[PDB]
Design a protein around this ligand. Sequence first.
Ligand SMILES: [Mg+2]
Ligand SMILES: [Mg+2]
Ligand SMILES: [Mg+2]
Length: 288
Amino acid sequence: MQTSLFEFANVLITAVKEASYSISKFKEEVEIKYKSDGSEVTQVDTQSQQIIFSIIKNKYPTINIIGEEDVENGIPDNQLPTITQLSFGSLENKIININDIIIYVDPLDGTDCYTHKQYDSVCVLVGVTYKGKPMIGIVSKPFYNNEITFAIENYISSISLQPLNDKIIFVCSKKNDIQHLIKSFPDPYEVKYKGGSGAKMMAIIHQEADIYYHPLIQSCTWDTLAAQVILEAQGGIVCDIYGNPLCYPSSKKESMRHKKGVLCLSPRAKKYLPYMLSISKTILLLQH
Ligand SMILES: [Mg+2]
Ligand SMILES: [Mg+2]
Ligand SMILES: [Mg+2]
């Protein structure tokens, strides 16, 4: 029924490292399955997910864990790396209840970025809730030396920050080019185009960007939670396009889409929330 936070964080970090390493070291020909809604999936996505699931469930067989892809655990204990024994500075090592935990996984965010050699946009995302409340976020960028960024509540791992721009930077994909939606923005600003939803949140975390405005029902729980915990630990904001907290259902039977969109603000961009809320105020998002 219970475990320590340090144990738990070590298991998750071990899983993410191993998955990231699997992705970055992979030279065989990729085979692209197409889901029944056109979206891509490769054996690299699924193998990454199995690694993550197997490592975690081998320690915590009861644990609630939700992943983008349709695979679970299975990889036998003796092919899995041993668990790291890291300590975490002044962070307090809590006893926690396994059944209060829910884990949300994207084994490979930017599957299309991957298949198009946009390797810089590929992330592994693992986020955790505890009693419904976001608690841990772990992000890896396999093609950026398997760099891992993570946060546990208000504590945050080492992170390189680009010198602040001074112009406010909006970041979006070309396909969701919101530049016309924000022409009335009060202060000087720029639009940077970046594929990958994980990548776009990381851009804010590394101060390459300030605002990620996603007034669309394209994001899922696993796309946001990991980066959310980190950005929030930095003092940034993640919410609906109407300013409310993102929802994280407890089961994959329920829809994992963020149906009221996504909005992320850098610490300094928090003052622009009212502006963004008045922009979103007349939008009714519809799904199909
Ligand atoms: Mg997909
Ligand atoms: Mg994915
Ligand atoms: Mg994704």
